Each structure stands twice: as structure tokens, then as C-alpha cells.
């Protein structure tokens, strides 16, 4: 009857390394190989009451007593030095290929049918729209999450590291290539065919991606934030902890991968927000809602089950969404 496989785990393609943060100055970015790293330092914060009171703390005496006991914390902070305005972020991205083949598949015949479905997809249209959109997310510094919302000028350099050496260099403008429009450009198309050859299986693709942001001299840069065990005293509470690898601030790899994943524009809601990350049930953490609900029949699982089990091939945009989820990978199938 060709049912779905119970175990359908997929490996991720487009694996990003941890994005190391350093500090430097603009126009010295052509020689940014010696730049001192951004160090996660500590600073003390004293706070008064700034949250909504639950109708019992709203008494003047209770509120003033809460004011007279301020909440003192220590926060991990990442700031540039006072002579440094440019934040450099470097990560390597490895494009693997073989996105059709699952890592685990209980049903052979289902594995053959899913491989035939991905093969007929690639015969219809190859990894070309998805690689173009992934290359657009490479070109703009969407991996610079909060280090781009107030940046004056952002620049992204991507090198093709074939045999440990630069096989092809690309330089971009991350502010000209916006976070909303998937336009066409010649260097963007060349990076799209490189990611296409990586995703199809034509060759091995490793990309070194370097980002420079005009934040400001001594301004706060925003790395990925860790998780707090909450065991110490309330005075030295350590409310915020940032991520570092070796005395050097960094962004998490899956955050970079999610930002490169932000290409999904074909969700049934309007284009007021723009592209979202290619998740099953199209989830966005900041908006707190799920585009591509299972009720509106545009989630990944319903589209894949129509495409594979009963040969109801969706529109080419939904086919791009399904293949982008297969590139993204996950533990699909019933647990």
C-alpha cells in the first residue's frame, strides 16, 4: 500500500562551523587575519522594577519596597574595544549532497519511492532555486542576527576552499542584497551553481564566509546566548551567559544554519514578513506562531505524503519547500 516509513531520519546538508567573532576596524578588513577576538567579559547591572505587576505589587508601599531592593546581577557582555568598530564573523560551510537519501529508512520500497521522487524533482528542476536562495542567505549577513539591525555597512566575503586554497572569491554587499527580495545577480548565480554542484553530488564544496559590520566604536556585539544553570546566589546571579569557544565570543552553528535556512517565502500567509526558516510546520520563534499549519495542508509532512505515497505532486514552490526540508534534515516519521 506504500505507507510512510516509521524511521525517516535525514542528515543535514549545508553544515556550518561555529562563527568566531573578532574585533577590528573598517578598511583593514583586507588584512583581518590577525584581529583580536571579541572576549566575553562581565559587567554588573542594577535594576529597578520594570515588569507588569500582577495587581498585588501595584500598591505604592509594596512597589517602593521592591524599588529599595534592586535586583543586582552580573551579565556576560560582548563589546568591541574603543578603537574597533568592525565586527568580523568567520565560519565554514560544507555542502554535502545526497539530500534524497535518508540516513535511516525502515521501508525499502518507501526509500526507493522517495529516491525516485527526489530524482524526478531534480530531472524537472535541479537544486537551482533552493541553491539560489541559500546563496542569497550567504550573500546577506542574515547569520549576523542582531549585529545587522543597527549596522551602518555590512560586507560578506565567500571563498571556495578546494585544496586548502581559494579556488574562487566572491565579495558582496549584505545591505544592498536585502533580507526580503530574492533577486538575480551574476556572482550570486555563480555561488548558486557552486551550491548546486554541492547539493547534487557533482563535487565537494567548502566555503569560508567572513562578515564585517559597521556597528560602532566600542559598541555591544551580540553573540549567541547560552543556558543558565541558576545555582548561585541572587547577588551574583549570572542572568546572561554568552557563547565562547576559546576565550573568544562566537555564534552557535545551528543559529548560522537557521539563518541560511531563512528562504521559505511560499507559506500561505502574506509576504509582509518576508522569508522564514524552512522548518516542518514553518515555525518562527520570534513571532511565536506557525506558518504552514497542518490545518491549511501546506506543512512538510502532508506535502511529502501527497508527493510520495499517492503521487499528488504539489506546486513547484511547495516542491522547493519539501526538498529544502530534506536538505535541512530531521527525525521525520513516527517515533
Amino acid at each position: 500500500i506504500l505507507s510512510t516509513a516509521s524511521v525517516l531520519a535525514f542528515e543535514r546538508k549545508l553544515d556550518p562551523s561555529d562563527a568566531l567573532m573578532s574585533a577590528g576596524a573598517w578598511a583593514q578588513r583586507d588584512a583581518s587575519q590577525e584581529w583580536p577576538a571579541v572576549t566575553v567579559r562581565e559587567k554588573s547591572v542594577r535594576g529597578t522594577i520594570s515588569n507588569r505587576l500582577k495587581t498585588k505589587d501595584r500598591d505604592p508601599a509594596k512597589l517602593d519596597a521592591s524599588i529599595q531592593s534592586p535586583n543586582l546581577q552580573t551579565v556576560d557582555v560582548a563589546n568591541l574595544p574603543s578603537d574597533a568598530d568592525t565586527l568580523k564573523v568567520r565560519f565554514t560551510l560544507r555542502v554535502l549532497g545526497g539530500a534524497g537519501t535518508p540516513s535511516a529508512c525502515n521501508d525499502a520500497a518507501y526509500r526507493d519511492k522517495l529516491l525516485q521522487t527526489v530524482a524526478t524533482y531534480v530531472n524537472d528542476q535541479g537544486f537551482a532555486e533552493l541553491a539560489r536562495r541559500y546563496a542569497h542567505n550567504l550573500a546577506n549577513a542574515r547569520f549576523l542576527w542582531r549585529n545587522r539591525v543597527g549596522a551602518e555597512a555590512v560586507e560578506v566575503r565567500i571563498n571556495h576552499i578546494r585544496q586548502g586554497e581559494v579556488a574562487r572569491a566572491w565579495r558582496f554587499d549584505a545591505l544592498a542584497i536585502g533580507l526580503r527580495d530574492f533577486k538575480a545577480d551574476a556572482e550570486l548565480d555563480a555561488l548558486a551553481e557552486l551550491i548546486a554542484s554541492g547539493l547534487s553530488g557533482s563535487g565537494h564544496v567548502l566555503l569560508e564566509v567572513v562578515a564585517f559590520a559597521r556597528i560602532g566604536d566600542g559598541q555591544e556585539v551580540f553573540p549567541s546566548q547560552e543556558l543558565i544553570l541558576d545555582k548561585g546566589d541572587k547577588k551574583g546571579q549570572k542572568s546572561k551567559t554568552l557563547y565562547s569557544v576559546r576565550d573568544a565570543a562566537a555564534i552557535h552553528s545551528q543559529k548560522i544554519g537557521n539563518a541560511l535556512r531563512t528562504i521559505d517565502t511560499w507559506y500561505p500567509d502574506e509576504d509582509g514578513l518576508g522569508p522564514i526558516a524552512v522548518e516542518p510546520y514553518g515555525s518562527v520563534t520570534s513571532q511565536g506562531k506557525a506558518y504552514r499549519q497542518p490545518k491549511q495542508k501546506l506543512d512538510f509532512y502532508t506535502l511529502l505524503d501527497n508527493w510520495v505515497l499517492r503521487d499528488e505532486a504539489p506546486a513547484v514552490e511547495q516542491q522547493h519547500y519539501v526538498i529544502a526540508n530534506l536538505i535541512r534534515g530531521g527525525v521525520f516519521g513516527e517515533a
Binding site: K54, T55, G288, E334
Partner: protein, 228 residues
């Protein structure tokens, strides 16, 4: 000796016997289906009740973890202040009109989720009565977390009849519902031998698959799913 079947649990001994101390011993193994949870060395002089009581603590711990792992969500009806919880209802699913909500004085009664980013709607007592009638969870709803999704779905084509293991979750012996085979056969209106054909697996002879309506009415009557 032989296996002890407590609902979905199987206490099966190793066929080899050891001689820990001077007395003979056997390594008894407790499985929840394919997953083992406790392998314990017990004497051959132990009765079946003592072997059951040795693993009863781990059985109760797994039952407590399953209750606290697949508990249904809780909707709180609060006043305009939003602090005094006037009512609490355990729901199988939340209303689709739920969005991120803080109560105000614009409406006298508000409905919220028990989660920390509370989702709710301004509700009246008639509308809250309608939502509680439509969406309330049955008492033994957590056993639906211990069943596969394809045996709880309401569409015919995407439904597989349950196995003897998933039937033994809810029907007989030390099942999580607590009922026996005779009581669950009385709820379904079938004979004791006819339902014993459903419960007992092994070969295909004297073993049939339960139908869609009988399985769904059994889960409705047992208070496991679709029982408002």
C-alpha cells in the same frame, strides 16, 4: 519459570540459572515492549507475587513518569485581574482562537493557558462552557501518549488496527486503565471469548483485528480519548 504479563509489561526470565550465594537464582528482565527497564537477579524460590513486587516500584515510577509526561494541557478561567484562577479545566486540545493574552478590565472573564507565555481569549461563561464541553480531556488521557498516532486518528484510510500490545495498554491484566478483559468486553457489548480473541495474539487463528468503531468506542468508554 514463565513470563509475568502486567498490561504492556512483560517480566521474562533468562533461561540460564545462576547460583548467587548458595541458592539458585535467575536473571529476571522487565520489558515495556522492546525496551527493557530493569534486569534483576531473583531467587528461584520466589513466587510470582514476589517477582511482581520486586519490579512494582519501577513499574509505578514509569506510570508516574508517563502521567507527568503526557498530561493534557490546562486552561484557567480567570477574572479581569488575571490572577485569581476562578476555574481550571484539563483540555485535550486548545481553542483555535487562542493568541498571546493578558487579561484587562475590558472583559470580566478571560481564558488562559497554564504555560508560561499564556495564550487565551476574552470569554463569557456561556462560551467558556461551550469550549469546555467541546475540548475537555478525559481523565485517563495520558495513555494516548503511550499509543501510536495511527490508532487514534479519526479518518478511515490513515487508521491501523491496534496490536495486542497496544490493546493490552488499556484492556486487561495490569493495564493503565485498571479495567479487566470482562469489564472492557462489557463496555463494548461483545462476549468474553470474542474479546479474548481480540486480546490474544500469537497466530492468526482465533485472533482478529478490532474494528474502527469498536476501538474508538472502547477508548471513549474507558476515558482515554474523545470522552468529554
Amino acid at each position: 519459570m514463565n513470563a509475568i504479563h502486567i498490561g504492556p509489561f512483560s517480566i521474562t526470565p533468562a533461561a540460564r540459572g545462576l547460583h548467587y550465594g548458595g541458592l539458585p537464582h535467575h536473571q529476571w528482565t522487565l520489558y515495556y515492549g522492546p525496551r527493557e527497564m530493569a534486569i534483576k537477579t531473583l531467587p528461584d524460590s520466589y513466587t510470582s507475587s514476589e517477582v511482581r513486587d520486586e519490579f512494582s516500584d519501577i513499574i509505578a515510577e514509569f506510570v508516574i513518569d508517563a502521567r507527568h509526561r503526557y498530561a493534557p494541557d490546562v486552561l484557567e478561567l480567570v477574572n479581569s485581574d488575571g490572577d485569581a484562577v476562578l476555574a481550571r479545566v484539563a483540555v485535550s486540545r486548545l481553542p483555535e482562537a487562542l493568541s498571546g493574552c493578558i487579561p484587562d478590565d475590558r472583559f470580566p472573564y478571560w481564558l488562559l493557558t497554564a504555560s508560561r507565555p499564556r495564550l487565551g481569549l476574552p470569554v463569557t461563561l456561556n462560551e467558556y462552557t461551550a469550549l469546555a464541553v467541546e475540548l475537555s480531556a478525559p481523565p485517563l488521557a495520558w495513555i494516548t501518549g503511550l499509543l501510536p498516532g495511527e490508532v487514534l486518528t479519526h479518518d478511515a484510510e490513515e487508521w491501523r488496527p491496534p496490536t495486542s500490545w497496544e490493546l493490552r495498554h488499556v484492556v486487561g491484566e495490569g493495564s493503565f486503565t485498571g479495567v479487566s478483559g470482562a469489564a472492557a468486553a462489557a463496555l463494548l457489548g461483545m462476549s468474553a471469548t470474542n474479546f479474548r480473541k481480540y486480546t490474544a495474539g500469537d497466530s492468526a487463528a482465533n485472533r482478529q483485528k478490532i474494528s474502527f468503531a469498536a476501538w474508538h468506542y472502547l477508548l471513549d468508554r474507558l476515558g482515554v480519548k474523545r470522552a468529554s
